[PDB]
Amino acid sequence: HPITYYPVDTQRLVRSNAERIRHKPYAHYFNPDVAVPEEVFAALKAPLEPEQVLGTSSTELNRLLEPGYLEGETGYCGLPDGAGYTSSLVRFPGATPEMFRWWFWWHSFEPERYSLWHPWCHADIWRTPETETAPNTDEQRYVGSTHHINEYIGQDPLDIEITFIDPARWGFDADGFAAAGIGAHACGSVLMKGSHMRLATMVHLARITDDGFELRSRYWIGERQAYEQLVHDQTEFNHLATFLPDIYQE
Amino acid sequence: VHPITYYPVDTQRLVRSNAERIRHKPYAHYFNPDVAVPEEVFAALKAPLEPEQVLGTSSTELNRLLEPGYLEGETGYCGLPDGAGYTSSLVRFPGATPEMFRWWFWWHSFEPERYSLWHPWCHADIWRTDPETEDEQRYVGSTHHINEYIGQDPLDIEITFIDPARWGFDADGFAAAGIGAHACGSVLMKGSHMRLATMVHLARITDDGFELRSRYWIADRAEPRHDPVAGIAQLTTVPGFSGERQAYEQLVHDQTEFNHLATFLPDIYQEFG
Amino acid sequence: VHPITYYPVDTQRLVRSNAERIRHKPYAHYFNPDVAVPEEVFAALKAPLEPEQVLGTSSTELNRLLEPGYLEGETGYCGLPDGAGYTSSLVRFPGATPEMFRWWFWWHSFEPERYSLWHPWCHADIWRTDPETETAPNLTDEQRYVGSTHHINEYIGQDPLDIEITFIDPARWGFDADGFAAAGIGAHACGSVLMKGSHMRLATMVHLARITDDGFELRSRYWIADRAEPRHDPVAGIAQLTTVPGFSGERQAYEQLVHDQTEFNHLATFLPDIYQE
Amino acid sequence: VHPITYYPVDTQRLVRSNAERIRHKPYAHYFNPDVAVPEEVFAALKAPLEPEQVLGTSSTELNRLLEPGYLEGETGYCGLPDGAGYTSSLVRFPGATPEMFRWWFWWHSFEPERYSLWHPWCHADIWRTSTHHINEYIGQDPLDIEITFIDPARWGFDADGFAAAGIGAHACGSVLMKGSHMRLATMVHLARITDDGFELRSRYWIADRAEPRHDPVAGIAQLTTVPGFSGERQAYEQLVHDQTEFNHLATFLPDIYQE
Ligand SMILES: CC(=O)c1c(O)cc(O)cc1O
């Protein structure tokens, strides 16, 4: 189902994104059409129950390594204090997790590449560039790096910084990833520019499936922010799934 | 289910050693110390079986396990007249298949850490003389050399699995009876070779998955369809040994670890089978 | 709460003989074999206390129990350096008053069947040689057990034990007994637990009932197989229990923890009713 | 956090007598001799502030304490030109509120045992007939002092700006010696609201010439005239004293305020 709500400022951004990407060789992947799968619609209408929230203890994070699904794979809710939580499953048919690793460095070296991923919300990305072409591993081209991002989440533009970390630092059983079909990850702290206020802890796990892979994402963020993040994640990662294999191939 | 409320002091140390050494194993996240037993077996924890409810070891008696439905005393324990003991234990495995049980019974035996997943508190060690052997052929005929707690103290035991036909089971009739897996064998004390148990595990297909029906004849006089082993004493001759108490320990032990296994067997089979 | 999942085989017989014996007693309807322990003590059943969490038996250490709030390791067990053991156990008695506890500690002691109410699985027998004390006029609740010796047969583990408990004035051990009321301590049951015959020390035992808004809380301490009664010399001629072949202070302390949590939580379920009746 | 490594010998005796005195008081539970200092002030313990880091006592200077954020030298000590001393001290009170601090500054004053909780080692006596007549150690020797608290505006603080500046409590006073009336300190305690509770920003002008917005008192010499007296040393003693007793109060103020 096509998205029915486009914040006014993103309506401007999609047009300026379209214009500046015109003559890039990956321009033909730029497509504003965004939609969310019928399977997630209920999650758009009702918050998760506190018995569907995953904790951040070593034990709870490693439950994601279990085959099959946990409760509340896709949804959002407010938490104790004004904190927030977001969960989101997105399927990537015809893709492999290696493509997800490659994507998470490749997009980060040009704002126009970043804009492919969410034409409406992605305004700017920068990194402080030798890493793109340094001789010799996909993970080594973004893990341990900081992505400076300017994007819309909801109506609000944000200026944030994401540093990607070895999942082991959070107590993930990294040695168990391969057996569990987890071929990619992207985990990090989301911090505000300047203030360095923590905004979210974020996990993205790419797990091999029969059809390709599936992306399982968790955000520990207020209640509003978690809802915007749910919409954001479903929108941009479903969008990425429509061209990731083709753009990886090319 | 109700959490276990009693953890012998030595096992409290073992569960921590086990947690430590299993770090960085690919199956580490299946290590979970939380153990419990289902409400439906609580009566069996509180009173022994009656003599009438004890299954014998003749071919006729063993083959009653192939009958549809259930027998008297599917779960319980009691002492037997010669100081021996008896344990029966039914454990449900929703979402699993007998194939998974067959797999588990060889796979776990090649690393102590795998063995520890099954009973985090009580399983200390396992080895076999044929590590080359890495479903039935992969554990039947094999001996598992085990160190584990079944009560307060660590035991060194040797479990050799056999073809159930050797004991008079209608092995041909297993398929028709819904028995898709079996693990039957003798449990001997390391060193003395004294018989700790004749042991039967039968996995019967159910609508939800399968159910494990287990029988143990503790400190018995002889392997089924055999003479007692000449020159080796019955375990009941050991001063201070109680077959009744040991049967109770085995009941608690079986219910604890096989219910534990039921909570992750389908998943770990998917990952590693 | 969570139901007990382990019943030693001899106690499975005992609960049945206890049920039979108590029939036609006036208090028979208080007999209930169902036993359970609170979620909050489960961590204590799974790992020992650290040595820093262990209270000593010096007067200064004992009187720490009068401090408001809690100490480290209110519930737990551990082994001690030279074969001895230690048990602490906190049990809540919602809806009860310390007076009921003083009453209970004499009232149960004059009939084995009353004693069986308390731990249906483990309590086999009790006797005292001053039966007159039960009905003597004008005695306080405390006067009816402090100074008395209870001869007890019970399970604290797999096997029956014959023990003798003599209840003392806590002042004898250096407790600021005159300061109990100010500290909200409304009842006590303290004494030495000795083995029948040998008179070896099985435990130095402290039970303090401290007033709460909900009722009271029972704070218990056991120093298992220790060498002397507090403020007293070791008794000449009698070996420490740790000298017995096969005795484990550590294991005994674990049994005492399970035993205390089981029976005092059980007592909490009916103490206010039986006191009322 | 690091335990104090230095206990003057008289205070070793005093923490004991305090321990005995308080035994059967309702609040005896809050008596704890353990005292420590946060890692962050350790630099302040090893070198004096520079002159540029000293706050003055004019209305504009005092009101700089209302400015958001921090000033130069939030924690430290130094000697001043006329032989006087200066102490600044920031102490965090996580879990607490300014109202608790207000409550404390009158509550403690009516029983010597209550005052004892605050600094177990140095606090010996207090009474009233506000003016607090105190016996305590701020150094090696027992001092008989008289602390009288005033309305901040009398020193020229922007009282109407306190709320907007997060200042939920204050305790400003003159500290005088018993008998001689010599001036030991001009003292300011400001409790500023923070995310985790509040922070106490203290300023002392030690052995100073005059109360703010006052002349010196006629016929009474400045304490800097006493033969063996050093404003510099006293300011260091006051820094240690302030960091010790206020970090200590922080460990039990919310609890004791509840009770
Ligand atoms: C009896 C028991 O504890 C047991 C068992 O029934 C099967 C097995 O493969 C290993 C074991 O240690």
Cβ within 8 Å of residue A32, ≥6 positions away: A14, A18, A119, A120
Q: How far apart are CA B78 and CA B48, in angstroms?
A: 5
D127 has which bridge partners?
Answer: D133
Tokens standing for residue A244: 């990731």
Q: Using DSSP bridges, classify how beta strands C123-127 and C160-168 pair: parallel, antiparallel or unpaired.
A: unpaired
Coil/strand/helix, residue D133: strand
Q: How far apart are CA D80 and CA D85, in angstroms?
A: 5
Q: How far apart are CA D160 and CA D153, in angstroms?
A: 9
**Closest chain B residue by Cα to residue C258:** B6
B218 pocket-lining for ligand 1 (C-beta < 6 Å): no
The widest CA-to-CA distance across chain D, in whole angstroms, is 50
Q: How far apart are CA A16 and CA A5, in angstroms?
A: 19
Q: Which residues of A touch B29 (CB under 8 A)?
A: 62-63, 65-66, 173, 176, 180
CA atoms within 13 A on the CB side of C158: 13
Tokens standing for residue B270: 């998917």
C78 has which bridge partners?
Answer: C86
Sign of the Cα torsion C50, C53, C55, C56 reads positive
Tokens standing for residue A11: 């309506």
Q: How far apart are CA A196 and CA A211, in angstroms?
A: 40
Spatial contact of C216 and C91, defined as CB atoms under 8 Å apart: no
The number of angstroms, rounded, from the C-alpha of D162 to the middle of its chain's C-alpha atoms is 20
Resolution in angstroms comes to 1.8
Contact between A67 and B267 using a beta-carbon 8 Å cutoff:
yes
Indicate the burial class of A51 (C-beta count within 10 angstroms; 0-12, 13-18, 19 or more).
Answer: exposed
Q: How far apart are CA D106 and CA C241, in angstroms?
A: 57
Q: What angle do CA A76, A82, A86 make, to 5 degrees?
A: 20
- Determination technique for this entry: X-ray
Q: Which amino acid belongs to residue C167? A: F
Place of tokens 């209930």: C32
- Compute CA distances B203 → B98, B101, B143, B186, D20, whole Å: 6, 8, 21, 18, 72
Cβ within 8 Å of residue D107, ≥6 positions away: D114
Three-state SS string over chain B comes to: CEECCCCCHHHHHHHHHHHHHCCCCCCHHHCCCCCEECHHHHHHHHCCCCHHHCCCCCHHHHHHHHCCCCCCCCCEEEECCCCCEEEEEEEEEECCCHHHHHHHHHHHHHCHHHHHHHCCCCEEEEECCCHHHCCHHHCCCCEEEEEEECCCCEEEEEEEEECHHHHCCCHHHCCCCCEEEEEEEEEEECCCCCEEEEEEEEEEECCCEEEEEEEEEECCCCCCCCCCCCCCCCHHHCCCCCHHHHHHHHHHHHHHHHHHHHCCHHHHHHHHC
Query: What is the rounded (10 degree) CA torsion for B235, B77, B47, C45?
Result: 80
The widest CA-to-CA distance across chain B, in whole angstroms, is 50
For residue C88, the distance in angstroms to the closest alpha carbon of chain D comes to: 22
Could you state, in order of their start, the residue ranges of all structural domains in chain C? 1-277
User: Which residue in C227, C220, C246 sits closest to C87, CA to CA?
Assistant: C220
Q: How far apart are CA C22 and CA C15, in angstroms?
A: 11
User: Which residue in C256, C188, C185 sits closest to C225, CA to CA?
Assistant: C256
How many Cβ atoms sit within 10 Å of the Cβ of residue A122?
24
Q: How far apart are CA A63 and CA A59, in angstroms?
A: 7
Spatial contact of A205 and A63, defined as CB atoms under 8 Å apart: no
How many Cβ atoms sit within 10 Å of the Cβ of residue C35?
21
- Compute CA distances C156 → A51, C115, C123, C153, whole Å: 40, 15, 9, 10
Q: How far apart are CA A225 and CA C186, in angstroms?
A: 54
Q: What angle do CA D95, D99, D105 make, to 5 degrees?
A: 105
b/e map of D111-132 (b: 16 or more CB within 10 Å)?
ebbbbbbbbbbbbbebeeeeeb
B199 pocket-lining for ligand 1 (C-beta < 6 Å): yes
User: Which residue in B228, B229, B220 sits closest to B83, CA to CA?
Assistant: B220
Q: What angle do CA C74, C76, C81 make, to 5 degrees?
A: 115
User: Which residue in C108, C156, C141, C140 sits closest to C271, CA to CA?
Assistant: C108
Using N-to-C axis directions, what is the helix angle for C249-276 and B9-21, rounded to 10°? 120
Q: Which of C12, C46, C48 sits opposite B47 (nearest CB)?
A: C12
What single DSSP character describes residue D5? Answer: -
Radius of gyration over alpha carbons of chain D, in Å? 17
**Closest chain B residue by Cα to residue A67:** B267
Q: Which residues of D touch C68 (CB under 8 A)?
A: 29
Tokens standing for residue D214: 């006052």
Cβ within 8 Å of residue C114, ≥6 positions away: C27, C107, C108
Q: Which of C3, C33, C46 sits opposite B7 (nearest CB)?
A: C46
Instruction: Name the region of A144 (left: φ>0; alpha: ψ -120 to 50; beta: rest).
Output: left
Is the Cβ of D23 closer than 8 Å to some Cβ of chain C? no
Q: Which helix (H) or strand (E) holds C260?
A: helix C249-276
B44 pocket-lining for ligand 1 (C-beta < 6 Å): no
Q: How far apart are CA C150 and CA C169, in angstroms?
A: 15
Q: How far apart are CA B234 and CA C37, in angstroms?
A: 39
D100 has which bridge partners?
Answer: none
Spatial contact of B69 and B176, defined as CB atoms under 8 Å apart: no
Query: What is the rounded (10 degree) CA torsion for D224, D227, D231, D232?
Result: 140
Determine whether the annotation assigns residue B37 to a binding site.
no
b/e map of D155-165 (b: 16 or more CB within 10 Å)?
bbbbeeebeeb
Is the Cβ of D29 closer than 8 Å to some Cβ of chain C? yes
Spatial contact of D213 and D155, defined as CB atoms under 8 Å apart: yes
For residue D201, the distance in angstroms to the closest alpha carbon of chain C comes to: 32
Using N-to-C axis directions, what is the helix angle for B98-107 and B265-272, rounded to 10°? 70
Q: Which amino acid belongs to residue C103? A: W
Contact between D29 and C69 using a beta-carbon 8 Å cutoff:
yes
Spatial contact of C274 and C95, defined as CB atoms under 8 Å apart: no
How many Cβ atoms sit within 10 Å of the Cβ of residue B155?
16
Give alpha helix (H) positions in chain A: 8-21, 58-61, 97-106, 111-117, 223-241, 244-249
A91 has which bridge partners?
Answer: A214
b/e map of D197-235 (b: 16 or more CB within 10 Å)?
bbbbbbbbbbbbbebbeeeeeeeeebbbeeeebbbbebb
In chain B, which residues are last before a break of more than 2.5 Å from C to the next N? 134
Q: Which amino acid belongs to residue B10? A: D
Q: How far apart are CA C168 and CA C163, in angstroms?
A: 16
The number of angstroms, rounded, from the C-alpha of C252 to the middle of its chain's C-alpha atoms is 14
